[PDB]
Amino acid sequence: IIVTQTMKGLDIQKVAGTWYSLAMAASDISLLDAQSAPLRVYVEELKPTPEGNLEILLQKWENGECAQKKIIAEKTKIPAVFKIDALNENKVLVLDTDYKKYLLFCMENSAEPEQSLACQCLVRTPEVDKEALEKFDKALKALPMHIRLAFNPTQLEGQCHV
Amino acid sequence: IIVTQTMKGLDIQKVAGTWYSLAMAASDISLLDAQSAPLRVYVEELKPTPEGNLEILLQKWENGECAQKKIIAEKTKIPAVFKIDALNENKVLVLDTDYKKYLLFCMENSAEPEQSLACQCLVRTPEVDKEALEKFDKALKALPMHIRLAFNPTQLEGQCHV
């Protein structure tokens, strides 16, 4: 319901390849509280499909091991919005990207936007990017976030951010 | 973490009574990551002693239960700085308080300050005090925090912030 930035004219062709989850924030602490939390997922690659859908390749900590996971995100009539059925979420919104440095996105469940919102700052390179983090924090300033995590370069490079 | 002009003239007797942990932040995500994390402690009461020490009464999730813990903070020559022997920390610093609404404090381990720093915003009622949170965030801007949690009234009223 709260209007945020959205990526007008998002071209997914241009988001393919490596990304690193630099920062994360969520409305409900439980979404991101513990390595085991349901929305603690680390984006490792984005893969647009021939049909214009988007595969999201993730790492996620489960039962003492770092697991590879893949979310299938279905295109919609809005370039920046995708439909999913994963992590108890049903939408992905791309807030902003410059393709070659950073990409900001949120996930939510349309049924319970207040209890399901989780957003990330992705960067292309495994460094703490000042521009990207500032843009992330600005983009979220009106959102009801109660947990925020920011990662260091060693964590960006390591499996499951260890 | 340093002794500021704000911290001068603290009267520890006046912090007696009931408090609630409204927000927490730490340098190392793993200090606060998960309910069971070592610095995930919820202050419920402060008990100053006649000789000027400070007992800190807390709730902490351990072995799948919400436990009560008491930490004795021993005075030093600086009124706002105390020695502790708990939580793999050895210092408590009171950054700021108005006695009747909010108190900001940090803990650290003087042998490894940067991987041990954890700070809290305490309030006198189980309500979200935006002004206290602003003071907290301003006080933390110079500190290398990587995790921040902010709690809601239901969490403040519950045991171990559930």
Describe the 3D structure.
Chains A, B: Its main location: secreted. Chains A, B: It holds the Pfam family Lipocalin. Two copies of one chain form a homodimer. Chain A is mainly beta and 162 residues long. Chain A has a single domain, classed as Beta Barrel (Lipocalin). Chain A is globular, with a radius of gyration of 14 Å. Chain A has three helices and ten strands, in the order E-E-E-E-E-E-E-E-H-E-H-E-H. Chain A binds chain B through residues 29, 33-36, 145-152, and chain B through 29, 33-35, 145-152, 155. Strand 10 of chain A pairs antiparallel with strand 10 (147-150) of chain B, so a sheet runs across the interface.
Set down the secondary structure blueprint.
Two copies of one chain form a homodimer.
Chain A: E1 17-18, E2 20-26, E3 42-48, E4 54-62, E5 65-75, E6 81-86, E7 89-97, E8 102-108, H1 113-116, E9 118-123, H2 130-139, E10 147-150, H3 153-157
Antiparallel strand pairs in A: 1-3, 2-9, 2-10, 3-4, 4-5, 5-6, 6-7, 7-8, 8-9
PDB class: transport protein
Keywords: beta barrel, lipocalin, transport protein
Assembly: dimeric
Largest interface: A-B, 13 and 13 residues
Structure classification of chain A:
mainly beta
Describe the sheet with the most strands of chain A. Answer: 10 strands, antiparallel
Lateral arrangement of strands in the main beta sheet of chain A: 1-3-4-5-6-7-8-9-2-10
Principal-axes shape call of chain A: globular
At the fourth CATH level, what is the homologous superfamily of chain A? Answer: Calycin beta-barrel core domain
Strand content of chain A: 35-45%
Question: How many strand elements of chain A?
Answer: 10
Number of domains of chain A: 1
Number of helices of chain A: 3
Order of helices and strands of chain A: EEEEEEEEHEHEH
Report the top-level CATH class of chain A.
Answer: Mainly Beta
The CATH topology of chain A: Lipocalin
Q: CATH architecture of chain A, please?
A: Beta Barrel
Spatial gap, N to C terminus of chain A: 35 Å
Oligomer: homodimer
Evaluate the radius of gyration of chain A: 14 Å
